[PDB]
Design an enzyme around this catalytic site. Structure first.
Site, PDB file in Angstrom:
ATOM      1  N   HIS A   1       0.755  -1.161   0.061  1.00  0.00           N
ATOM      2  CA  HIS A   1      -0.044  -0.313   0.073  1.00  0.00           C
ATOM      3  C   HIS A   1       0.716   1.269  -0.032  1.00  0.00           C
ATOM      4  CE1 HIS A   1      -2.848  -2.915   1.766  1.00  0.00           C
ATOM      5  NE2 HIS A   1      -3.494  -2.515   0.817  1.00  0.00           N
TER       6      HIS A   1
HETATM    7  S1  FES Z   1       1.453  -1.170   3.985  1.00  0.00           S
HETATM    8 FE1  FES Z   1      -0.198  -2.191   3.629  1.00  0.00          FE
HETATM    9  S2  FES Z   1       0.466  -4.011   4.155  1.00  0.00           S
HETATM   10 FE2  FES Z   1       2.135  -3.056   4.271  1.00  0.00          FE
END
Ligand code: FES
Ligand code: HEC
Ligand code: HEC
Ligand code: HEC
Ligand code: HEC
Ligand code: HEC
Ligand code: HEC
Ligand code: FES
Lengths: 423, 181, 235, 423, 235, 181
Positions: free
Chosen positions: B146
Site C-alpha cells: 500500500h
Molecule cells: S503497507 Fe499495506 S501491508 Fe504494509
C-alpha cells in the site's frame, strides 16, 4: 391471471400414477411455463449465464480435486501434474480460473441491470437481499480458491485480506489466528480454504434455489414500471420455448467468446507471479490481488489522512476508530448500503427509463465503478489518492443521498401503460 | 408446571447444543503443534556489515541489518516530533521513547548501539514484507502492498501503517551470534 | 523486427527443429546452473515438441546426475520417469520450468540473454561479482546511476548471471550458423515448450469449439427469428 | 381431510409481507403440522435418527477435511495430527467412524420396519425406490471413506471391491483402470475417493429431500392396513409437538448410548490392522472388509462350485458366465429384488400383523440377515459354505416366490377398521 | 490375576509414575531397535501422562539422534518440536507408536515381553537366529511341531526379537523392585500412552455427556407423558 | 422447415454436450505419469535358495522363489488332469500346456528349469497377495481373502480363483540377475 395451468395430469396413466411424487407438476406448471412479458431486452439473459457458469465451475472443480493435493509441499506440483499429465488438464484449470472471471463480470451486469430498472424497488426486496448474500459467499469462495495453487500472490493476498480482520481492536488478533489456524499462513490455512472452497458452492446453489423461488412468486421486472396486469393477460408469453431459446442463443455466443479466450488469451487475466513458488521471506512488487476486488481494495486503501477531505482526523475523536478500522468499515458499508438501497430510494416510480437525472447519476456510477477498478492497481502516490477518495465519496453519496432527492423531485416523464408495447 | 417444564426442556436443549457447537469453533484455533512458537540462534558471522540479513522464524522474517553511517546520522537526527509512532515497539525494554539510542539494539555485550538493528520484517498495516536495501523516500524500507515509508531505524513514516517495526526480545551471544526468543 | 516466434498467433505448432536446437544448448550451457524439476524426461518423446527417439532419452537420462530414491535411500540410475535435476544454491539460479509464464514471456528471455553489454558511461567500474544486463529490471543499481529520488537512469540493471554465450559456443548437427541470436531464440522456444507443452492441442480445441458453437448459435438464431415472427411482423 | 391449514398469513404485518417468499407457509402448513396417526409405535423414529446422523457425519467430515491431507505419504500422519494435536480430534474421528455404524444400523431397522408394515406396498413405491438409491449411495460413500486413512485394511478392501468390477468380461479391466486411476491402487485412487466421499452426502440430502416430499404427499404407513380416512378425521394428530417430542426423546437415548460407546468402546467395531501403515507387498489375515457389507460379501464368496446345489456348473452352459460374474450378479440381484418387492407381493392386504405365515417367514429373514452378517467373517471352509449357500438361497426365495404364494393364500385374519384404535 | 492396569475401566487416568518408569525403560532398552515417529517429544510435558519438566525434555531431545532438516539439508540439533527417531532396518523392528491398538492391546505386550522361555521338548535345537515366544502368533513353526494339517501344536511361535530384559536390567530412581514383570507393565502403559494420550479427556467427556443427555431425556419423557395424557387416560 | 430445424438444433446441442462430457470421463483414465509402466532388474544375489524373494514393481509384487526338491517333485508329479487352469499363464511363451517344464522358468542362460520360478504375486480372483513359505493344503500359497489354494508351481487349486499365477516376461542376465519387463 398468473395462469399456472397445472396440466391436470390428464396426459395418460403415466402422468396419473405420478400423483405419488408431484415433481413434473412443479416443473411444468411453474418453472417452464412461467408467464414472462414480451418487453424483455438482452439484459435479462445473464441469470442463465450465471447458472451455467456455476454448474461449470462446480464440475471442473470436482474434477480438479481428483488431482489437487492440499499441502504446501505438493500443491504446485499437483497443479503441474494436472496441466501436463492429465487428459484435459489445462482445459479444466483455464476453464475453472477464467470462468470465475466471467461469473463476476456477469453478476456485475446482472446487478447494474437491476439498479436501472428498479428491480430492487418493492415488491422485490427478498431477491435483492439474497443476491447480496450470494455475492458475499462467492467473493469469499473465489478468495479461498486463489490461494490453493500456493503460488506467490496467493500467500500475500491471503496475508493482507486476513490482516484486515486483525485491524479491528479487541477481537482482531483472536479472529485472525482462529481463521489462519495460527499466527501466520501455513498448511492449516490451506486445508481450511480447500474444504471451505469445496463446500460453499452448494450453499450458493440452495440460495439460488430461493433466488429462483422468489422471482417466480414475484414477477420478473420488465423494462417498464408496470406489471403483467393480472385480472386474460394477452401479454406475458411463457418462458418455454421463446425466452429459453433467446437465452440459449446469447449463452452460445458468450461461451464462444469464453473458449476463444481460454484457447488464445488464457493467461491474460492472471498474475504471472502466481507461477513462482512461495517465499514467505520475499514480497513481489504490485501484489494487485485480483480484478473483482479492486474497487473495495481501493475504498480501503484510500482513507489514510492524506487529504483536506480526510475524515480520519475527525474520526480520531474516539481513540479507537483509527484509519485501518475506518477503511474496513467503509468497505463493509460500501456493500451494506447497496443492500439497503430498496429502503433508501423514496420514489413511487420505477425504471429510470423515465427518470433522466437518475440516468445521468447512474452512468456516473458505472464510470465510478470502472475507475475504482482501474485505481486499485495503481500506487497510492499522487494523484491517484484524490481520485480514489472522490470515487468512494461519490459511491456513498449516490447510494445515501442521491436517491431520496430524486424520489422527491424526479417525475418529469410520462410513464407507459399497457405492458403490451406494440410500437 | 406447564411453563417451568417446557422452558426448562428448551434451556437444556440449548445448553447441550452450545456445548456441542463450541469445539467445532475451537478446533480451528492454533493446535499444539503451533503452540511451540520457540527461539532461533542466528549467527551474524561476518556477512559484510551494512547491507542486510534475513532469517525465517515463527513463520515471519527477522531482519538483522548492520548500520551505514549515512543511515545512522539520518536516524540520530530525527526529533520525536513529526514521528508517527514514538513508542519504540521493541519489547526488550519498556515503552521508552522511540529513540535511536534505545531503538538500535543491545551492545554486543559491550557498549555501543549505532551499529546493529534487528526488527520484525512485518509491516504493521496488514503484515506485508517491506523491501530493504535503501528504498523509499526516507532511505529505509518501502512496503509495496500500500505504500508505507519506513525510516532508517524502522519507525513508520508516510503511509497508513500506524506504528514502526517492532523489535523482538533478543540478546547477544558474545560478539558472534544472535538469540531470537 | 520484433522477431516473432512460430507459435505467436492462432497457429504455429512449435517448429521442432528449433526445439532440438534449444535442447542442445540447454543441456550443454544452462543446465550447469539451472534446472527444470517440473519437467519429466519422458516428455522429449511426447508429440507437439521434440519427438526424439526414446532410446536416446533413456541414454541421456542415465547420463545425468543421480536422483536417489523415494523408498530406499540408494543412488539409482536416474530413470526417465524421474524429473530433470535441480540446481539450488552456491552460485546457482532459479528453476526454468515455467519461467516463460512468470514474466510477453519468451521475448523477455530473448531480449535478456540478448544484452550483457559493458558498463555504461555512468559507472564504468561497475560492481565486483555482479554483471550488467540491458533488460533485467529487478537488479541493484549503483548510486551513481540513480536519479534524485532513487529511480535508475539505466535501461536495465545488474544481474547475478554471467554472459552465457560467446560468438560460436556450440555446433548444430543439422547445419546452421550458431550465432548468439539463433541460440537465444531456440532456447526461448525450448523453455516455452517446457512451460506450455499442450499449446497445439489448445489451439486445435479452440478452433473446433469456435466452429461448433458458431454453428449452434446460428441455428438458434434461426429458431428464434422463426418463433418470434408472428409477433414482429406488423411493426 | 388432509387439513393443510396454511395459516392464511393472518398473524400480523410480518406474516403479511412474507407474501414475497412463502417459506414459512411451507414449513407450517406442510412439514410441521402434517397429520400423523395416533397408532405409531417406537419403530417410526429411526428416520429422525437417520437425518440427525447424516447431519452429524457431514459436520464432522467438514471439520476433519481441514486437517486430512489426501496423499499416500501424509494421510496416516494427518490422522494422527488430528487424534493428538487438534482440539477435539479423537472426538470428531470416533464420532465420524462409529456414526457410520449407527447410520447403517438405523437404516437396517428403518428398512425391516418397512418390510413388515407393508410400507413398500402401493401407493408407496417411489419412497422405496428412492430409499434403495440412497442405500446404494451411502454404501459407496462409506466404502470410499474407509480408504482415506491409508491403513492396511483400506488398501486390500479397495483392491478386492474393485477387482469385482474387473471380473465381468470385455469391459472389466477398462472400468477397473478408469476407477482406480491406473492398473492398481495408488494416490490417484485416494484423490478420487476423497473428492467423491466429500460430494455424495449432498446428493443424499437432496434424495432425502425427495424422500421427505414423497411420504408427506403419501400418508405415513400406520401400524395397520388402513389410511387416515380423509373425508373431519378426529384421528391423525399433528406432528408438532407430539411426535417431534417422542422422536427427540428416543434420539436423546440413542445419542446417550452412542457417546457412551465413543468414550468407552470406540475401537470395538473397528479393525486393528487399520492402525498399521500399508504394505502393498504383504496381506494380513482375515481382511474382513467391514460389518455392513458382510451379507453381500458372503453372497458373493458363496457360489464357488462346491456343493450339489452348485448352480455354477449349470451356468457354465454359456462359456462367459463364470463363477465370479455369477456371484457379482447374485449380489446386484440381492439388492435389485429388494427394490422390485412392491411389484412381487401380489396381496391386496397390508401389515403382516394380520398375516401369520408372513410373520414366520419374515422372522426367518431377519435371522438370515444376522447369519449372513456372522458368516462373511468366517473362512470358506466347511461347514460355513453350506450355511452361506442356504442363507442366500432363502433370501432370494423369500423375495421371489414366497410373497406371491402368500398374496394368494394368506388371508386368515380380521383386518382392523377405524384407525382410531381406542383399545 | 489378569493384572489389570489402572486405565482398564471407566476411570484410571494413567498413573504417571508408571509412565515415567516405562520411559526410563523405553529409552534405554526398546529404543535401540524400535521407534515412535508418530510421537512428538513435547508430549512429555502435556498433561495426562508424564508431566516431566520441559528443560529435561529439551536436554533429552538434544541428546538423541540427528534429524537433519526439511528445507536446508544440514544435521540439526533435533529440537523437541520434531518427532522421536525411527529405527527402520538391518536387525530392527516396527514402530511402537500405535502398537497398543493394532492388536486387549497392552495385555498383548505384557504377555509377549513376558514369555521367551527355552525351546520346548519337541524341537529343543530350535532355529539359528530366531528365538521362541509363547504368545506371538504370527511367527514360523518347525515342521516337527506342526500337526497333520499344518496347524502348530505350540502355544505361540518363533519371533525375531530377542529377550529384551534380564532379572535386574535397570534401576528406578523412585525406589522400586525393577524385576522383569514390573518393567513389562510399565512399558506397556507407556506405549498405551503413546497411542492414546487423550484417554482421560475421553472419559471425562463421556461422563459429562452421559449426564447431560440423561437429564435432557428425562425432561423430554416428562413432556411426552404430559402431552399424551388426555389421550391415554380412559384406557 | 419446422421439423428439420427444430430437430437439427436439438441434435447439435446433444453433440456439443457429449463432446463436453467425454473429457470429464477421460481425465479419470490412467495419466501419462502412469503410462510409463516399465521394467526392473532384481539381483538374485545368493538369497539362500529355497525360501522366497519379493520385489515391488508396477505397484504389485513379483515373486522370485527358488525351488525345494520336495516342492519340485510335488510339482512334476501333477498330471494335467484335475488342473483347473492348464494354460501356463506365463507370457514369455505361447499357450503351451501348464507344465512344470515350461512353467518353471528360463534356464539361467544354461539348461535347467526345476530350480527357479518367478510369477506375479497377485491372486487372479480379485488381486490379493497370497501367503507364501509353504502354506495351504497343497504345499504352496494360500490366499487369505477368500481361501484359494495354489500349488507348488503356482497353478490354482481348491478355491474360486479361476486361473493360476501368471508369469511376466523375464530373461536372465548371465547367472546373477533377473530382468522384469
Ligand atoms: S503497507 Fe499495506 S501491508 Fe504494509
Ligand atoms: C551460472 C554460471 C548460470 C548459467 C550458466 C546460466 N544461468 Fe541463468 N541465472 C543464473 C543466476 C545466478 C540467476 C539469478 C540472477 C539474479 O540477478 O537474480 C539467473 C537468472 C536467469 C533468468 C531469470 C532472470 C530474471 O528476470 O529473474 C533467466 C531467464 C536465465 N537465467 C536464463 C538462462 C539461460 C537460458 C541460460 C542458458 C543459455 C542460463 N540462464 C545460464 C545463473 C546461471
Ligand atoms: C532388537 C535388539 C530389539 C529390541 C531391543 C527390542 N525389539 Fe521389539 N522387535 C524387534 C524385532 C526384530 C521385532 C519383529 C519380530 C517379528 O518376528 O517380526 C520386534 C517386535 C516387537 C513387537 C511386535 C510383536 C508382534 O506381535 O508383531 C513388540 C510389541 C515389541 N517388539 C516390543 C518391544 C519392547 C517393549 C521392547 C523394549 C522393552 C523391545 N521390543 C525391544 C527388535 C527389538
Ligand atoms: C469441487 C471443487 C471446486 C469447486 C466447487 C470450485 N472450485 Fe475453485 N478451485 C478448485 C481447485 C482444486 C482449485 C485449485 C486448482 C486450480 O487453481 O485450478 C481451485 C482454484 C480456484 C481459483 C484460482 C485458480 C487458479 O488457477 O489460480 C479460483 C479463482 C477459484 N477456484 C474460484 C472458484 C469459484 C468462484 C467457484 C464457485 C463459486 C469455484 N472455484 C468452485 C476446486 C473447486
Ligand atoms: C445482488 C444482486 C443479485 C445477485 C448477486 C444475483 N441476482 Fe439474480 N436477480 C437479482 C434481481 C434483482 C433480479 C430481478 C428479479 C425480478 O425481476 O423479479 C434477478 C433475477 C434473476 C433471474 C431471472 C431474471 C434474470 O435477470 O435473468 C435469474 C435466472 C437469476 N437472477 C439468477 C441468478 C444467479 C444464478 C445468480 C448467482 C449465481 C444471481 N442471479 C445473482 C439479483 C441478484
Ligand atoms: C466433509 C467431508 C466428509 C463427509 C461429508 C463425510 N466424511 Fe467420511 N471421512 C472424511 C474424512 C476426512 C475421513 C478420513 C478421516 C477419518 O478416517 O476419520 C473420512 C473417513 C470415513 C470413514 C473411515 C473412518 C476411519 O477412521 O477409518 C468412514 C467409514 C466414512 N468416512 C463414512 C462416511 C459416511 C457414510 C458419510 C456420509 C454418508 C461420511 N463419511 C461423510 C470426511 C467426510
Ligand atoms: C430402502 C428403503 C429406505 C431407506 C434406505 C431410507 N428410507 Fe426413509 N422411509 C422408507 C419408507 C418405506 C418409509 C415409510 C414412508 C411412509 O410410511 O409413508 C420411510 C419413511 C421415512 C420417514 C418418515 C417416517 C419414519 O419412518 O420416520 C423419514 C423421516 C425418513 N424415512 C427418513 C429417512 C432418511 C433421512 C434416510 C437416509 C439418510 C432414509 N429415510 C432412508 C424407506 C427408506
Ligand atoms: S482375492 Fe485371492 S482368493 Fe479372493
Amino acid at each position: 391471471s398468473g395462469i399456472p395451468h397445472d396440466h391436470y395430469e390428464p396426459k395418460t396413466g403415466i402422468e396419473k400414477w405420478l400423483h405419488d411424487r408431484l415433481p413434473i407438476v412443479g416443473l411444468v406448471y411453474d418453472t417452464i411455463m412461467i408467464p414472462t412479458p414480451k418487453n424483455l431486452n438482452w439484459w435479462w439473459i445473464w441469470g442463465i449465464v450465471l447458472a451455467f457458469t456455476l454448474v461449470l465451475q462446480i464440475v471442473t472443480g470436482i474434477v480438479l480435486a481428483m488431482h489437487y493435493t492440499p499441502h504446501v509441499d505438493l500443491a504446485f506440483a499437483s497443479v503441474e501434474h494436472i496441466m501436463r499429465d492429465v487428459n484435459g488438464g489445462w482445459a479444466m484449470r483455464y476453464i475453472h480460473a477464467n470462468g470465475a472471471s466471467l461469473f463476476f463480470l456477469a453478476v456485475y451486469i446482472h446487478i447494474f441491470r437491476g439498479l436501472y430498472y428498479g428491480s430492487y424497488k418493492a415488491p422485490r426486496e427478498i431477491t435483492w437481499i439474497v443476491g447480496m448474500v450470494i455475492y458475499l459467499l462467492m467473493m469469499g469462495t473465489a478468495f479461498m480458491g486463489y490461494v490453493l495453487p500456493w503460488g506467490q500472490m496467493s500467500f500475500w493476498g491471503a496475508t493482507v485480506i486476513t490482516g484486515l480482520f486483525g485491524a479491528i481492536p479487541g477481537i482482531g488478533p483472536s479472529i485472525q489466528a482462529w481463521l489462519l489456524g495460527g499466527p501466520a499462513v501455513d498448511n492449516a490455512t490451506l486445508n481450511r480454504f480447500f474444504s471451505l472452497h469445496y463446500l460453499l458452492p452448494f450453499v450458493i446453489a440452495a440460495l439460488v434455489a430461493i433466488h429462483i423461488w422468489a422471482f417466480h412468486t414475484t414477477g420478473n421486472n420488465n423494462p417498464t414500471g408496470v406489471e403483467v396486469r393480472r385480472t386474460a393477460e394477452k401479454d406475458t408469453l411463457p418462458f418455454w420455448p421463446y425466452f429459453v431459446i433467446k437465452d440459449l442463443f446469447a449463452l452460445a455466443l458468450v461461451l464462444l467468446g469464453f473458449f476463444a479466450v481460454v484457447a488464445y488469451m488464457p493467461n491474460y487475466l492472471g498474475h504471472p507471479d502466481n507461477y513462482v513458488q512461495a517465499n514467505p521471506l520475499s514480497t513481489p512488487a504490485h501484489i494487485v490481488p485480483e480484478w473483482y476486488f479492486l474497487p473495495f481494495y481501493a475504498i480501503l486503501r484510500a482513507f489514510a489522512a492524506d487529504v483536506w477531505v480526510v475524515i480520519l482526523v475527525d474520526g480520531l475523536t474516539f481513540g479507537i476508530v483509527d484509519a485501518k478500522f475506518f477503511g474496513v468499515i467503509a468497505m463493509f458499508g460500501a456493500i451494506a448500503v447497496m443492500a439497503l438501497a430498496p429502503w433508501l430510494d423514496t420514489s413511487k416510480v420505477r425504471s429510470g427509463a423515465y427518470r433522466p437525472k437518475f440516468r445521468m447519476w447512474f452512468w456516473f456510477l458505472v464510470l465510478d465503478f470502472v475507475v475504482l477498478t482501474w485505481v486499485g492497481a495503481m500506487p497510492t502516490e499522487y494523484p491517484y489518492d484524490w481520485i480514489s477518495l472522490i470515487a468512494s465519496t461519490y459511491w456513498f453519496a449516490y447510494f445515501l443521498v442521491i436517491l431520496p432527492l430524486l424520489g422527491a423531485t424526479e417525475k418529469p416523464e410520462p410513464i407507459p401503460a399497457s405492458i403490451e408495447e406494440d410500437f | 408446571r406447564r411453563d417451568f417444564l417446557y422452558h426448562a426442556t428448551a434451556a437444556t436443549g440449548v445448553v447441550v447444543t452450545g456445548a456441542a457447537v463450541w469445539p467445532l469453533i475451537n478446533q480451528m484455533n492454533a493446535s499444539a503443534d503451533v503452540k511451540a512458537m520457540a527461539s532461533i540462534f542466528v549467527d551474524v558471522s561476518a556477512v559484510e556489515v551494512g547491507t542486510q540479513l534475513t532469517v525465517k522464524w515463527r513463520g515471519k522474517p527477522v531482519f538483522i541489518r548492520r548500520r551505514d553511517e549515512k543511515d545512522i546520522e539520518l536516524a540520530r537526527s530525527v526529533p520525536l516530533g513529526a514521528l508517527r509512532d514514538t513508542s519504540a515497539e521493541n519489547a526488550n525494554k519498556p515503552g521508552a521513547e522511540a529513540t535511536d539510542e534505545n531503538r538500535t539494539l543491545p551492545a554486543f555485550d559491550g557498549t555501543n548501539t549505532g551499529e546493529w538493528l534487528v526488527m520484525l520484517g512485518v509491516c504493521t498495516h496488514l503484515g506485508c514484507v517491506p523491501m530493504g536495501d535503501k528504498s523509499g523516500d526516507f532511505g529505509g524500507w518501502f512496503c509495496p502492498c500500500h505504500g508505507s515509508h519506513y525510516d532508517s531505524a524502522g519507525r513508520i513514516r508516510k503511509g497508513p501503517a500506524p506504528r514502526n517495526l517492532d523489535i523482538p526480545v533478543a540478546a547477544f551471544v558474545d560478539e558472534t551470534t544472535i538469540k531470537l526468543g | 523486427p520484433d522477431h516473432a516466434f512460430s507459435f505467436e498467433g492462432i497457429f504455429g505448432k512449435y517448429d521442432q527443429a528449433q526445439l532440438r536446437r534449444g535442447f542442445q544448448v540447454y543441456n550443454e550451457v544452462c543446465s550447469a546452473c539451472h534446472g527444470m524439476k517440473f519437467v519429466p524426461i519422458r516428455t522429449l518423446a511426447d508429440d507437439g515438441g521434440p519427438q526424439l527417439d526414446p532410446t536416446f532419452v533413456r541414454e541421456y537420462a542415465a547420463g545425468l546426475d543421480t536422483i536417489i530414491d523415494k523408498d530406499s535411500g540408494e543412488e539409482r540410475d536416474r530413470k526417465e520417469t524421474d524429473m530433470f535435476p535441480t540446481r539450488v544454491g552456491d552460485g546457482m539460479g532459479p528453476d526454468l520450468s515455467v519461467m516463460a509464464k512468470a514474466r510477453g514471456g519468451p521475448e523477455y528471455i530473448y531480449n535478456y540473454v540478448i544484452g550483457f553489454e559493458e558498463n555504461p558511461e555512468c559507472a564504468p567500474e561497475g560492481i565486483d561479482g555482479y554483471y550488467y544486463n540491458k533488460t533485467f529490471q529487478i537488479g541493484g543499481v549503483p548510486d551513481t546511476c540513480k536519479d534524485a529520488a532513487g529511480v535508475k537512469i539505466t535501461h536495465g540493471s545488474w544481474a547475478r548471471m554471467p554472459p552465457p554465450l560467446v560468438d560460436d559456443q556450440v555446433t548444430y548437427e543439422d547445419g546452421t550458423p550458431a550465432t548468439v541470436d539463433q541460440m537465444a531464440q531456440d532456447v526461448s522456444a525450448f523453455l516455452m515448450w517446457a512451460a506450455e507443452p499442450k499449446l497445439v492441442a489448445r489451439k486445435q480445441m479452440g478452433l473446433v469449439a469456435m466452429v461448433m458453437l458458431g454453428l449452434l448459435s446460428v441455428m438458434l438464431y434461426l429458431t428464434n427469428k422463426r418463433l418470434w415472427a408472428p409477433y414482429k411482423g406488423h411493426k
